[PDB]
Ligand binder design. Structure first.
Ligand SMILES: OC[C@H]1O[C@@H](O[C@H]2[C@H](O)[C@@H](O)[C@H](O)O[C@@H]2CO)[C@H](O)[C@@H](O)[C@@H]1O
Length: 296
């Protein structure tokens, strides 16, 4: 592997993304704002050399929903290794649905999609998921996490629509609250014609070459998640991926599971909570040490 893109920081980092401002594809109670409005609302910036991307935790929400940003990289990658070092990620906040992921080019779901860091509400464990067209299932080995769903197809029979094929990390510090309390860590994601692997290195435990000029995944510990096997054409189900950061609220996932988990008591429904409790979302932010993409 060799470096192909060091995303830098602050404005140089933001220049590498298009800010999505359309209504949320996942129907959340979110108001994705432009870069200028986000900077004016303090949702994006630089914090001591780190890149910050958060949500409005000040104002009662109105309009489409609570203000946030969704950045989609201008560049795409066919195959490669995406390494992100985060000092902080959106917390395990009720009503939230943060995600750092990649989305293939072309019509959904034919380009495939990879959820590297994702969860909802008060989740504890990171949930790594793939989303593809039909004809793509994964094996049970080569990873430390626990497989929850094996079919990556958006309409896998018996699975909720777009639940995808997901593996749940075993470390309670792999997401939200726990992750932030340890000062974050590093998530490395490798995309090859034979599958996808995602490693989670909690702060301090990362390999010595993960942030360097030639990271070599082959020598790293077992990944937290691995998507591979003959039940999928890894090369054909995934085309060029673009990197995406977002934090939405309620919507298709978080809003539909709100009333069953531990957040149900905070409010009648997800929307009312997100609308009337701005201060709840102070922890819903990404704080990037670095984002580097490599190619074979
Ligand atoms: O987990 C069950 C839940 O899945 C929801 O789909 C999510 C999917 O899990 C997530 O990885 C993707 O990023 O967003 C979709 C939103 O549709 C599904 O919508 C729920 O009905 C279902 O209970």
């Amino acid at each position: 592997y060799h470096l192909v893109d060091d995303y830098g920081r602050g404005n140089g980092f933001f220049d590498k993304f298009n800010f999505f401002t359309g209504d949320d594809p996942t129907h959340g109670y979110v108001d994705y704002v432009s870069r200028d409005v986000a900077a004016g609302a303090g949702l994006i910036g630089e914090r001591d050399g780190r890149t910050y991307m958060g949500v409005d935790f000040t104002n009662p929400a109105s309009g489409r929903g609570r203000r946030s940003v969704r950045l989609e990289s201008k560049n795409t990658y066919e195959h490669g290794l995406i390494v992100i070092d985060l000092a902080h990620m959106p917390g395990s906040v009720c009503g939230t649905w943060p995600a750092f992921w990649t989305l293939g080019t072309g019509d959904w779901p034919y380009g495939g999609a990879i959820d590297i860091i994702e969860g909802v509400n008060d989740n504890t464990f990171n949930h790594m998921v793939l989303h593809t067209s039909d004809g793509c299932t994964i094996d049970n080995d080569g990873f430390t996490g626990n497989l929850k769903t094996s079919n990556c197809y958006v309409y896998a029979p018996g699975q909720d629509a777009n639940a995808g094929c997901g593996i749940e990390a075993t470390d309670p510090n792999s997401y939200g609250k726990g992750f932030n309390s340890i000062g974050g860590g590093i998530y490395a994601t490798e995309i090859t014609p034979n599958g996808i692997s995602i490693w989670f290195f909690p702060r301090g435990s990362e390999p010595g070459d993960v942030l360097g000029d030639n990271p070599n995944p082959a020598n790293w510990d077992t990944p937290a998640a691995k998507f591979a096997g003959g039940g999928c054409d890894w090369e054909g189900k995934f085309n060029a991926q673009r990197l995406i950061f977002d934090v939405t609220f309620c919507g298709d996932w978080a809003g539909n599971v709100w009333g069953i988990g531990g957040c149900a008591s905070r409010a009648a429904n997800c929307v009312d909570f997100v609308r009337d409790n701005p201060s709840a979302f102070a922890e819903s932010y990404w704080l990037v040490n670095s984002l580097r993409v490599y190619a074979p």
